[model samples]
Target: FACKTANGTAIPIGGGSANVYVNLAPAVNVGQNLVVDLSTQIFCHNDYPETITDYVTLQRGSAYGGVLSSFSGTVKYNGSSYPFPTTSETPRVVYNSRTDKPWPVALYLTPVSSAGGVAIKAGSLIAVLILRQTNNYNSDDFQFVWNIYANNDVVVPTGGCDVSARDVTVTLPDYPGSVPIPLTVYCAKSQNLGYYLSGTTADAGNSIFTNTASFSPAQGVGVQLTRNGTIIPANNTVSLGAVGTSAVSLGLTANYARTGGQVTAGNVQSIIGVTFVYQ
Candidate 1:
């Protein structure tokens, strides 16, 4: 007796809402987009069709970093790349498959009535998603989500990578004045590495680390942070390099400079945050 079975499973892309952070430089312009390859895998029993076209759905609750400009997917068949025709009724808002194509297109290696028998199919699809910065964006980190669906089965595979930076503390003398202090921030091994500095009491339109230190005394000085002797303006990204894959050491210097008024005796403190970004 010959027996056969069919089943469908729904696996959300990136396990769920892909938490990602991208540190796009201010020089990225207003129309340029960040493109990255998303490795998507598809698995199905041989009972499906031989040519399957899929659909995707993107959800951004006005909290995404940039706009979803465009995307494409290319599947590997018989050692050759088979590109799929994708479309979206409402670009940047709702991304889906071709509206002309019908459901259950095809996703089988061989027909059920083939000469020998049906063969289970499983392979990866390289999809490229582009995020364009059309509007003004701050240096602060952000998160977003996306999803994919095809046929009757839920082919959900969102794209993105999580980026995080380690925290460090810098201490200064009780009466450290007019003296340049040294500090360092370690960048762990990551991808598309980039970083920026931020503080609550940062100088307006300046890179000086303002005195955000709580429970302090006397105010007349601000801490200045520098990278390679160059001041990294607050809320500005300082890219270490492009798409890195190794550890990096950032050598920084902090100096307590008198902003105004007279210097007094007391605890001088400030806080600076180093935020990392990965493309």
Candidate 2:
């Protein structure tokens, strides 16, 4: 039994490469996953003496640039799906099996839901070599070469983590003339967490959250926030991470920024709108 090209020619290791391009998000978290369908053409002629289930093995090729620890794959043929080997060193079990006694093997092999995860870096390669042969019998007979490249940058929508408090009120101690006040908020544990601020008014140039108090408010002060110990720009999403099972306690800091005018002491209040995003 043998699998060959359409014209009955054996495919070499590096010959007749199938380029599979898959789009990936420009930015991804550590555990995010993605799956793509694959189909390639081939011709198999069966005439061997024995009638048994044919086995195949998959291995990362030379041009693979994706993170091995984060990569996963699956192959589908003859109405069954099989998973690829997890590790690089061991050949393990074949992805799928088939009986070739009836002759004229399937013209196409479908690899569904292959590649991707949080660790798949942008512009990385996900190439693999699939060889079909009996269990240690005749060694090599069929070759399915793949050169899947993770190309393009697109926003793949994702949602899972839930916010603990959609509306949070942090009452800071009486502010000194100039001092930073530390604040903390709790949210769900997630690796892909990001947030952006919004309100009726803000100081975009200085990245300050202005007060929207209806009555006479503090004359010369505004709120400035820092995420994960770094000052974040106003209205821009600040990406962060939190692990473990419990809620993620976000340690944030708010500082009083002088926005001109006299320091008239009144109600120093600001209505800050924070929207958390998960990717």
Candidate 3:
């Protein structure tokens, strides 16, 4: 999404009115690419004149809180001396094999004029990636099931906002098969923070099978497996119809509060867990 500031006035930072909206498409499969471009114009005003030194912010939304991405070009209010300053810009973001899940992504713009006043605009873009199965198993040779669980926490200065969790379970018919599964976890601010998983688990804190902690922003950061309160070093992928019955556990450190008087907060820690099962 993109937006331009109205003439004779400058947008304020942290101010919601100046924001623009963007729509994100679905995830691309491995070996595929996704790109996006956005822009906005800034005008000058008497009460809030725009100078060449003026600037704005670009923010990205995650499963957690807002994450700051980049800043925009400066605003030039000098019309007579510099003539109306018109700037056209384009920026690009990418998703590669390193990305393991698909989710909704958004962008926001915040204007900062020389007058010290700020204006903000917001928009959304989705990030999705496809997964293809390797022909390592025959359709009639094995059975499969996939599960995902997510937990989040937002701690305020006064405490509270401790922990939250959600789970997604899927059962595949027949033996081995491949399909594109949409990951709906971390679809909102309250759901994007803390711990997560991509496989079945025995307990909210203990994953039952192979899983990966894709993102997390909390204490005791890392991923592991457990059964009956015992820790286990388990791989993220498991063979179907295995004889073992164990649980996977994922943990992480909390995100820090934003202290800088910037328009948006910093990145929040997150975990993505992926577990593969074969029968």
- The number of the candidate with the highest TM-score is 2
Deviating ranges (above 4 Å) for candidate 1? 1-165, 173-192
List of clashing residue pairs for candidate 1: 13-157, 13-158, 49-107, 49-108, 51-106, 52-106
Q: Tens digit of lDDT per residue, candidate 3, span 1-279? A: 111232222233322223322222212111111111112222222222232121221122111112212322212112111111113321212222222222122222222211011112233211111111111124222111111111112111111111122233333222222222232211111211222234343334443331233443222222333323333322433322222212222322111222123323122322335332222
Give the lowest summed-lDDT range of ten residues in model 3: 154-163
Clashes of each: 6, 0, 57
Compared with the true structure, the alpha-carbon lDDT of candidate 2 equals 0.46
RMSD (Cα, Å) of model 1? 17.9
Predictions: Cα RMSD each? 17.9, 13.1, 25.1
Stronger candidate by lDDT (1 vs 2): 2
Cα deviation of 28, candidate 2, in Å:
21
Tens digit of lDDT per residue, candidate 2, span 180-249? 4333333223345666766654564747777766687878777777655676656777655554334554
